[PDB]
């Protein structure tokens, strides 16, 4: 039921930090995304969207997010790249759909959306449904940085451009992936 | 707003060419261009494409290793060279501009430059 | 991976059809490029079913979930070319075209 709030909403958050929201007893129609066209994928895996109006979960997350078009493969069991590793791994064993579509009329400015961010550097990957909102001013080479951002001292959250006169594959996309347990 | 190609080219096989796309409107803004090819008689074939704007260039993974699209703002041309010419390199390359407004298309067309690759 | 048909003749004044097949396709993104005899492709359909400023309300667009097909009304002489399909798969992040199809006039 608040669907509404989660695809309707005015602002998403960065990839680097995600949201999530809290769907239980609540009737839930899965019919309406697939007959909504104001998407531009909508792929499941393991479950189907076919079954998916009769059926009683325990509970359901939704992870809201945006990231690029490009970056949209990512968002799949068994993926690598600077998303799916640093910013949100899915589990291999993923049952439940990935909604994404285009919203370039909304997250992209023409002066440059330097509102959305990704997190470049990492020394760990993401465990599947993890969530790091770290500030670490990370270090790749062999002098400790411990707060100072000199040489091989990064601050690993970068942002996105999101200028609208660019093609699809560097567009802001926003994704919603449903997860059922 | 439109393309401009190379002129036609006769490189023989195994060598390396370079393919130059000159935009017509001064500068090519923030636009993003990807490069297309077409073998004789056949169809039509993504190899990458590049946004001079911001520097960042994507190749297709049938591509992904022998191609290499990089621009220079100096003059905002976009260039495309295939290193390892076989002879089933022959084709007609075209360089158009990625859309913004259709979700995924090609808008400007350039008219298209040939290389032959034969001994 | 998007596949057509190799080619397709139709009488004139007729409508012709053009498939295009491919795997979970976008439910907003089918675009369809003509290309004449030593020509550029030229974008005469894009999204689906939407057409560019300057382009004949002939062609249409439709599509059926893993199926899109070009619609060309009222087919006359000036009709002969290829026609390619194409989509900015998002799980591949490429752009995919189409086989082909030629399209004859009959006569």
């Known amino acids: 039921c608040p669907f509404g709030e989660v695809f309707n909403a005015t602002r998403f958050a960065s990839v680097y930090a995600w949201n999530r929201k809290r769907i239980s007893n609540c009737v839930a129609d899965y019919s309406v995304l697939y007959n909504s066209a104001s998407f531009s994928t909508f792929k499941c895996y393991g479950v189907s969207p076919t079954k998916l109006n009769d059926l009683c979960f325990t509970n359901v997350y939704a992870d809201s997010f945006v990231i690029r078009g490009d970056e949209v493969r990512q968002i799949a069991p068994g993926q690598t790249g600077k998303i799916a590793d640093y910013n949100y791994k899915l589990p291999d064993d993923f049952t439940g759909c990935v909604i994404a579509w285009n919203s370039n009329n909304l997250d992209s400015k023409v002066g440059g959306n330097y509102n959305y961010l990704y997190r470049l550097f990492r020394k760990s990957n993401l465990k599947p449904f993890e969530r790091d909102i770290s500030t670490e001013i990370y270090q790749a080479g062999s002098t400790p940085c411990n707060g100072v951002e000199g040489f091989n001292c990064y601050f690993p959250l970068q942002s996105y451009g999101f200028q609208p006169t660019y093609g699809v594959g560097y567009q802001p996309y926003r994704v919603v992936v449903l997860s059922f347990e | 707003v439109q393309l401009q190609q190379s002129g036609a080219e006769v490189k023989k096989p195994g060598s390396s060419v370079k393919v130059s796309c000159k935009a017509s409107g001064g500068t090519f803004g923030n636009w993003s261009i990807s490069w297309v090819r077409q073998a004789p008689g056949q169809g039509l074939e993504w190899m990458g494409g590049?946004?001079?704007?911001?520097?960042?260039?994507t190749y297709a993974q049938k591509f992904q290793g022998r191609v290499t699209i990089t621009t220079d703002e100096s003059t905002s041309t976009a260039y495309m060279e295939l290193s390892s010419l076989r002879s089933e390199d022959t084709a007609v390359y075209y360089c158009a501009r990625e859309t913004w407004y259709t979700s995924g298309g090609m808008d400007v067309w350039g008219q298209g430059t040939t290389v032959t690759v034969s001994s | 991976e998007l596949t057509q048909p190799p080619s397709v003749s139709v009488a004139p004044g007729k409508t012709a059809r053009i498939t295009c097949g491919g795997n979970n396709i976008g439910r907003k993104s089918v675009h369809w490029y003509q290309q004449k005899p030593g020509q550029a492709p030229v974008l005469v359909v894009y999204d689906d079913s939407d057409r560019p400023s300057g382009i004949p309300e002939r062609f249409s667009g439709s599509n059926s979930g893993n199926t899109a097909t070009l619609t060309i009304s009222r087919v006359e002489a000036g009709d002969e070319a290829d026609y390619y399909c194409?989509?900015?798969?998002?799980?591949?992040?490429?752009?995919?075209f189409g086989t082909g199809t030629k399209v004859e006039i009959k006569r």
């Open positions: 194409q989509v900015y798969d998002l799980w591949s992040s490429d752009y995919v």
């Open positions: 590049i946004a001079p704007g911001r520097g960042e260039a």
